[PDB]
């Protein structure tokens, strides 16, 4: 598992790899905010 | 704001769908 120290940082890491996907989605948000898309 | 409405609504929809996907791993129909 994680080192005992950084044990407390388990749930956050569970969400870490899902972040790039969000970036993709964010693009669309940005566009919709501008006036395109 | 229209775009904020669309974003919020989309997040809501994806959240419900995510709950369904979670439901495939828990309770009935999970082979557990």
């Amino acid at each position: 598992q994680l080192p005992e120290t950084y044990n407390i940082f388990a749930p956050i890491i569970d969400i870490m790899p899902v972040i790039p996907i969000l970036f993709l989605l964010l693009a669309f948000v940005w566009q919709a905010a501008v006036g395109f898309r | 704001p229209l775009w904020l409405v669309v974003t919020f609504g989309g997040i809501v929809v994806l959240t419900v769908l995510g709950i369904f996907i979670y439901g495939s791993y828990s309770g009935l129909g999970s082979s557990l």
Partner: peptide, 27 residues
């Protein structure tokens, strides 16, 4: 009780995106 932590962290990241966009949308 780990699930609540996970969903809170998730909520914070997910919200982090749109917040930056909104903030810059005001300026």
């Amino acid at each position: 009780w780990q699930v609540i932590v996970q969903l809170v962290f998730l909520a914070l990241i997910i919200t982090t995106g749109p917040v930056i966009i909104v903030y810059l949308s005001t300026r």
